[PDB]
């Protein structure tokens, strides 16, 4: 339903549904590195650690469950080669804090995208808007996105799906919670 083909390119059907995250009024955001998220689940993960090689696209579906009395806006953006950065040190991020698996991570500074760039300009990447008063779902189709024709799934994350609440969730009660469900369906997985 109104999918977004990234960069105007259209490259199975398992739709690995990750554990839903809780959107609170103080949430900063969540991110998943696409090859790493599915590296430990399903036939995708089994084939990934069976072979030294991998080549495929992705299909992303993000859905929220909220009532008509809820308000908020989400930016569902897929960042290619989202090389993260540290906040107050010159040392590079480590393997533990980069490869978060299917659990994913949270944005420390969503304003600067944990990269030092601007969130306001993040719309240049393939993205969709989830405004709770108009829609509650977003679908993005991701192409190959690699300089090399071949890649190592266990060492390089080609895509990073980021969900950032631009407008915080709100309702009459001071505490609000709205589940967010992320489903990833690799296509032509190798």
């Amino acid at each position: 339903a109104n999918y977004c083909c990234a960069y105007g390119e259209w490259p199975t059907d398992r739709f690995y549904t990750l554990k839903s995250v809780k959107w609170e009024t103080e949430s900063t955001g969540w991110w998943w590195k696409l090859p790493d998220a599915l590296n430990n689940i399903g036939m995708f993960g089994q084939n990934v650690q069976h072979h030294y090689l991998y080549r495929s696209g992705f299909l992303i579906h993000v859905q929220c469950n909220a009532t008509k009395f809820h308000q908020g806006a989400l930016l569902v953006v897929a960042i290619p080669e989202h090389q993260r950065g540290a906040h107050n040190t010159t040392t590079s991020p480590g393997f533990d804090d980069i490869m978060k698996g299917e659990e994913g991570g949270t944005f420390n500074h969503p304003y600067v995208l944990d990269d030092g760039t601007s969130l306001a300009c993040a719309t240049i990447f393939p993205h969709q808007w989830i405004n709770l008063r108009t829609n509650n779902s977003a679908t993005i189709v991701l192409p190959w996105m690699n300089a090399a024709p071949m890649d190592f799934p266990l060492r390089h994350n080609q895509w990073t799906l980021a969900i950032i609440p631009v407008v915080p969730l709100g309702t009459r009660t001071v505490s609000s919670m709205v589940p967010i469900t992320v489903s990833i369906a690799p296509m032509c997985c190798e």
């Binding site: 090389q83 760039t117 601007s118 969130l119 300009c121 240049i124 300089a147 060492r155 080609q158 990073t160």
Partner: protein, 215 residues
């Protein structure tokens, strides 16, 4: 509309590196690896202007044209002006996977496989065009991955790319009078192709190898 093309936007010569070195009768072990020569790994993420301009894209593919400008001067004034004797300099492009010189008289200077250019100070600046040297189809400005297969690898360092290393030495055997020579390297990307534009950098850079931000 032609001025704002990517090729015109990025193809501007810039002082990628500038490093002077003395050469006075360096028979002793004074200033190891700086006796009469200097080396510079060819990396584009050295000056913040070029960093911010190039980091507007995810993948780049270009040929680097290098012009070397050398000047010689002395502040000692131990004798008359007597002019400046004409020195011949050797600039050798050592690509990745090859051995770089460690001393001014190392046998790597006469390898016969590494491309080398010999030019004089009085001559116009030497120009060479380094082609697209990458095993992949494009350079990775940003790399969301780890170099080595072991977990001790560095984040963001692509073992691909790595254009190469540039070494410059004074060919002349050390003359009785020492001299200070300054070599300026200007790189101008050519035939540039860019993919996947990215938000501009907003915070000051913290390191040449990390995307770390202050704040």
């Amino acid at each position: 509309v032609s001025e704002t093309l990517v090729e015109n936007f990025l193809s501007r010569a810039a002082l990628v590196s500038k490093r002077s070195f003395e050469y006075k009768n360096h028979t002793s072990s004074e200033a190891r690896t700086d006796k009469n020569f200097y080396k510079w790994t060819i990396n584009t993420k050295s000056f913040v202007q070029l960093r911010r301009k190039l980091e507007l894209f995810t993948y780049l593919r270009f040929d680097a044209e290098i012009t070397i400008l050398t000047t010689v001067a002395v502040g000692s004034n131990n004798s008359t002006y007597m002019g400046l004797p004409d020195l011949t300099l050797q600039a050798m492009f050592v690509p990745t996977g090859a051995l770089t010189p460690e001393k001014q008289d190392s046998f790597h200077w006469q390898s016969g496989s590494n491309a080398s250019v010999f030019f004089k100070v009085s001559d116009p600046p030497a120009r060479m065009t380094i082609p697209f040297m990458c095993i992949n189809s494009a350079y990775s400005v940003f790399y969301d991955g780890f170099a080595g297969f072991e977990k001790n690898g560095l984040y963001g360092i692509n073992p691909a790319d790595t254009i190469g290393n540039l070494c410059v030495r004074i060919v002349n055997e050390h003359q009785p009078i020492g001299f200070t020579v300054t070599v300026r390297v200007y790189m101008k990307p050519k035939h540039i192709k860019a993919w996947a534009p990215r938000p501009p950098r907003t915070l000051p850079y913290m390191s040449i190898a990390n995307a770390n931000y202050k704040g």
